[PDB]
Every structure is written in structure tokens, then in C-alpha cells.
Symmetry: C3
Subunit: 67 residues, 3 copies
């Protein structure tokens, strides 16, 4: 059974090897995907900041206009 | 030391590896769904941003006449 | 070759798997952490965006009294 247990081990080892290299490729793809998503969230944030800052100016212009 | 002892160890580790690989796969899949979910969320947020930009523009000319 | 050789090999590949496994676990946790963080920020963005929308309604009202 030793020969057979060992053969079973070499087969499972092989499948492990193949899976691990798949997990590795996907993980590093996901990191990049996340980089893109962070990129967009940050730009969105900047756009939001610009919008908010312009609201303040609008609110201030309205006050000047009120006089 | 004996081959039987070493194969027994190897089997023990092999099993631990199979359970770990399953958890990895389960948790990788969760992280991929989240990537897709986050991406859907960002698209929705960009969309609302643009509309806000365009309404703020409609306000800016409403104000420009009254100046 | 010998069951001895095949077992030594299995042990060497099996150590390689354990190390790689630790590294992929890490990389996956980093991907989870980055997602959770990014979820927080996109909710904050949207919360502030909702405040900008209610603010613009008040701005139209104020604009109405000016004319
Ligand atoms: N929605 C919206 Au606005 C401004 N300023
Ligand atoms: Na986090």
C-alpha cells in the first residue's frame, strides 16, 4: 500500500501545484483590479471635492447678491 | 525516520493543504464577488456625480444672469 | 526511482507548497483589506454626495427670492 499511498500523494501534490499556480495568477490579477477601483474612487472623491467647493462659492455669491 | 512514518506525515500535511486550498478558494471567490460589487457601486456613484456636475452648471448660469 | 527517492521529492515539493500557501493567504488578506477600506470610502463619497443634492435644493430656493 506504501507504493499506492505514495502514488496517491504524487497525484494530489500535482493537483495542488496546478491549483496554486492558478490561485497565484488570479490573486495578482485581483490586486490590479483593486488598483483600478481605488483609482476611480479617488478621482470620484476629487470630483466631489470640486463640486462641494463650488457650492460654497455659490452660497457666498448668493449672499453678496442679497445685498 | 521510517518510510511509513514519513508517508504518514506527508499525508497529514497533504490533508492540511487540501483544507487550506478550499478556504483559499472560498475566500478568493468572495473577494472576486466584492470586486464586481464594488465596481457596480462606483459606476452608480460616478453616474450621480455627473448629474450633480450638470445641475450645478444649470445653477451657475441661473446665477450669472442675476450678476 | 526508489520509494525513498519519491518520498524525499514529495517532501521537497510539499515544503514549497506550504511556503507558497502562506504567501497566497497573505495576498488574499491584503485584497480583502483593500476592498473593505474601499467600501468605506465609496459609502462616505455617496453620503457626502447626498448632502450636496439636498444643498442644491436649498440653493434654488435662495435663488428664487433674489428675483
Ligand atoms: N445636485 C446638485 Au448641485 C450644486 N451646486
Ligand atoms: Na479595511
Amino acid at each position: 500500500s506504501v507504493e499506492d499511498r505514495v502514488t496517491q500523494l504524487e497525484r494530489i501534490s500535482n493537483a495542488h501545484s496546478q491549483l496554486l499556480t492558478q490561485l497565484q495568477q488570479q490573486l495578482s490579477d485581483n490586486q490590479s483590479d483593486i488598483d483600478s477601483l481605488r483609482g476611480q474612487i479617488q478621482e470620484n472623491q476629487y470630483q466631489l471635492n470640486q463640486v462641494v467647493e463650488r457650492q460654497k462659492q455659490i452660497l457666498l455669491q448668493i449672499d453678496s447678491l442679497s445685498s
